Amino acid sequence: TLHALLRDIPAPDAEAMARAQQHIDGLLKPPGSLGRLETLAVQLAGMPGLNGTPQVGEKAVLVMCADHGVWDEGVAVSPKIVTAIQAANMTRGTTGVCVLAAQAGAKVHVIDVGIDAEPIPGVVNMRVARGCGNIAVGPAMSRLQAEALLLEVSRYTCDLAQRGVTLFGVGALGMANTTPAAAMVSVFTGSDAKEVVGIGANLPPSRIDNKVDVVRRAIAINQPNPRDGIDVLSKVGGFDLVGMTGVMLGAARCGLPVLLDGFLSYSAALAACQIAPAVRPYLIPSHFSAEKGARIALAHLSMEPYLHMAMRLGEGSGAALAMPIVEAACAMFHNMGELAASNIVL
Amino acid sequence: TLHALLRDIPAPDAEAMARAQQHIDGLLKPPGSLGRLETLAVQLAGMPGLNGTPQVGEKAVLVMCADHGVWDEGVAVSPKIVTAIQAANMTRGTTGVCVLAAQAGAKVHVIDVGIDAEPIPGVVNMRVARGCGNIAVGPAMSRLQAEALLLEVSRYTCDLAQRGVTLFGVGALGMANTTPAAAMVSVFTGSDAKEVVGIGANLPPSRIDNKVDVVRRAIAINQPNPRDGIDVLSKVGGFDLVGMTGVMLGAARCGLPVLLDGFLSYSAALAACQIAPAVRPYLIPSHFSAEKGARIALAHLSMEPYLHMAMRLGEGSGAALAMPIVEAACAMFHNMGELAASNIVL
Numbered sequence: 001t002l003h004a005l006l007r008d009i010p011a012p013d014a015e016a017m018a019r020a021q022q023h024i025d026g027l028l029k030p031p032g033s034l035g036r037l038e039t040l041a042v043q044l045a046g047m048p049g050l051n052g053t054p055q056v057g058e059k060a061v062l063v064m065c066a067d068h069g070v071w072d073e074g075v076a077v078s079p080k081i082v083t084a085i086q087a088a089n090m091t092r093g094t095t096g097v098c099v100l101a102a103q104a105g106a107k108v109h110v111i112d113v114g115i116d117a118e119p120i121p122g123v124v125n126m127r128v129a130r131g132c133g134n135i136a137v138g139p140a141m142s143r144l145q146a147e148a149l150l151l152e153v154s155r156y157t158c159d160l161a162q163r164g165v166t167l168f169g170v171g172a173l174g175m176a177n178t179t180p181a182a183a184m185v186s187v188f189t190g191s192d193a194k195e196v197v198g199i200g201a202n203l204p205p206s207r208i209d210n211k212v213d214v215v216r217r218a219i220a221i222n223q224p225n226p227r228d229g230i231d232v233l234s235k236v237g238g239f240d241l242v243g244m245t246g247v248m249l250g251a252a253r254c255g256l257p258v259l260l261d262g263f264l265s266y267s268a269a270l271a272a273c274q275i276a277p278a279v280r281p282y283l284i285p286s287h288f289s290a291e292k293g294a295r296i297a298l299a300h301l302s303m304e305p306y307l308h309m310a311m312r313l314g315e316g317s318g319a320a321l322a323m324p325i326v327e328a329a330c331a332m333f334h335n336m337g338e339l340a341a342s343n344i345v346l
Numbered sequence: 347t348l349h350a351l352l353r354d355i356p357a358p359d360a361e362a363m364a365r366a367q368q369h370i371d372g373l374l375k376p377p378g379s380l381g382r383l384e385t386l387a388v389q390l391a392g393m394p395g396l397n398g399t400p401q402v403g404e405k406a407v408l409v410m411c412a413d414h415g416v417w418d419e420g421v422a423v424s425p426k427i428v429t430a431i432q433a434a435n436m437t438r439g440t441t442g443v444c445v446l447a448a449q450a451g452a453k454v455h456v457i458d459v460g461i462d463a464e465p466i467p468g469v470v471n472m473r474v475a476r477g478c479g480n481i482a483v484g485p486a487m488s489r490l491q492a493e494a495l496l497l498e499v500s501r502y503t504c505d506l507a508q509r510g511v512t513l514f515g516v517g518a519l520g521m522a523n524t525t526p527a528a529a530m531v532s533v534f535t536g537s538d539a540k541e542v543v544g545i546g547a548n549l550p551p552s553r554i555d556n557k558v559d560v561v562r563r564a565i566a567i568n569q570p571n572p573r574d575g576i577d578v579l580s581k582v583g584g585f586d587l588v589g590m591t592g593v594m595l596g597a598a599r600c601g602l603p604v605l606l607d608g609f610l611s612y613s614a615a616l617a618a619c620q621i622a623p624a625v626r627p628y629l630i631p632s633h634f635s636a637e638k639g640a641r642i643a644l645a646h647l648s649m650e651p652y653l654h655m656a657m658r659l660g661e662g663s664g665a666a667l668a669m670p671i672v673e674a675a676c677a678m679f680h681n682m683g684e685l686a687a688s689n690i691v692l
């Protein structure tokens with residue numbers, strides 16, 4: 001039902017947004033003084049799954065895990081098995097995103113969408129294959145596979161709204177995944193690879209040329225169509241990137257907010273917004289990733305992150321870190337007194 | 347005892363910082379990937395009142411309230427009595443900083459250092475006078491008054507460390523106070539008034555020239571010495587700015603972190619750091635204020651805020667908003683697993 005899913009993403013609710021603006025202007029402060037807390041509160045009020053008001057109930061960070069055949073091109077200094085080890089660490093609460101999610105009172109959902117290892121007990125199993133194809137020589141997956149994964153993850157995501165989740169975050173875990181992320185960013189924005197290829201997980205300065213060349217080769221051989229984000233995902237993305245796009249389609253379909261993380265997630269967000277522009281009003285940035293291509297990706301999303309933390313972990317820890325800011329916008333909205341009640345005219 | 351206070355601010359503890367760096371590098375993530383969470387955790391580990399480790403116990407936001415005779419120069423469109431009304435609102439929990447402090451689990455301490463109204467029951471009374479002098483025609487206060495206020499507020503601040511507070515935030519509330527803040531910023535940084543004078547609380551575009559002229563007049567008539575921050579405070583600052591400087595001197599003397607808020611607080615921080623450069627390692631930025639002179643002030647502090655919220659409320663709400671980030675750095679530090687325990691070498 002993918003066509004129906006995309007078709008049925010709701011528009012933001014202009015009426016609820018006008019009522020929200022009106023309330024904010026009347027609060028106990030100079031009009032506009034809380035800046036982007038104000039604009040964030042109105043954006044949230046517009047999302048139909050929030051029931052006409054900025055609010056946060058339960059929070060979930062979905063961490064999408066997979067391996068990538070492009071690891072064989074020597075674009076990642078972390079050994080391949082780190083994806084599987086770290087995915088298992090997610091079930092024990094010891095990773096960055098686990099710790100930051102706990103701090104924010106969010107639950108982490110670890111989803112294996114294609115790790116090249118035995119299944120990890122405890123991890124949600126949506127595995128497409130044991131790793132995707134090497135994008136340097138051919139596609140990451142078939143279109144059927146990318147579509148099926150989008151539908152499954154989007155259904156999983158919107159189903160969490162039944163258990164009270166009203167705010168998602170997304171992240172990805174997959175050795176070498178900054179390579180397809182950079183291929184996709186280059187394709188969607190028209191920037192040359194050299195401008196959007198970063199060091200990812202501490203790649204030595206001397207291997208950057210190889211990684212730029214591998215991105216260009218992937219684009220050259222696959223010839224992804226920039227106007228078909230599912231084509232771009234299936235050809236030069238990865239299962240974890242498709243997985244993050246699926247969380248965004250599902251949150252949007254559910255009329256609910258989703259916090260981006262870093263560059264991996266911006267690449268997925270570019271795909272999501274190409275596939276269904278109606279996704280865009282549900283997306284909330286968290287932080288401004290240290291990765292080279294972060295600025296270019298965020299400009300094409302017309303997004304300005306709240307947090308400048310020079311972070312590049314990418315598995316959702318940035319999204320978790322911004323959940324308190326969303327909660328702060330709701331608290332301001334609901335808990336502030338009003339000017340009129342103090343007799344103050346400004 | 348002001349000379350003794352300044353003399354006895356402790357140096358950061360290099361040994362504790364080295365032990366902290368070592369621990370962070372060994373955590374379950376690529377080295378350096380949590381970016382400024384890492385550097386923040388080490389900075390905190392260095393502050394002797396934190397006992398050799400990044401941690402947060404109790405949190406306090408001190409909101410310093412006073413009126414300013416420069417209001418008579420027509421530099422503020424908010425009526426003067428708003429300082430007193432809002433200070434009373436602080437005791438009822440309905441202001442921005444109250445709401446955001448509650449969200450962060452911090453307590454707000456509202457301190458009247460010179461409101462031009464009857465005493466507000468419920469507010470800490472350290473009032474120097476009912477408003478300071480009009481800085482456009484003479485000094486805000488005598489040096490004796492500024493010194494006495496610094497000592498009192500710094501003693502109050504460090505005394506909260508007995509009740510378990512380990513993290514402060516600062517803010518100010520005072521109609522017209524962006525005028526002395528801009529005078530001080532101009533004096534300490536050598537920037538012309540026109541570069542650092544902002545709209546404060548929604549001053550109409552057409553009154554900006556007057557406010558620039560009033561800043562220049564204040565500097566011209568008082569001739570504050572840029573190398574004596576107490577001179578600058580007493581001549582062209584205000585009681586609320588001196589009050590914020592006092593919180594920074596006291597937190598530093600106590601070897602404890604203090605979160606800045608916006609432009610008002612940056613002006614106080616410039617004074618604090620001129621008076622005692624040993625204050626600087628205790629200061630943590632929160633957000634990048636929307637005020638015109640924010641960039642210049644923060645450059646002279648070599649500070650890069652975490653949060654880009656286009657905020658300009660200024661009464662501590664920014665400081666409260668960043669308390670979760672400090673807590674997040676401690677959680678990362680204490681709660682993450684270690685690479686070695688997973689057999690991972692990167």
Ligand SMILES: Nc1ncnc2[nH]cnc12
Binds near residue numbers: 030424
């Ligand atoms: N000008 C202003 N009006 C109302 N509340 C405030 N808090 C800080 N500044 C203020």
Ligand SMILES: Nc1ncnc2[nH]cnc12
Binds near residue numbers: 086173314376
């Ligand atoms: N390269 C990497 N190593 C360890 N943990 C991670 N989490 C995300 N990326 C990682």
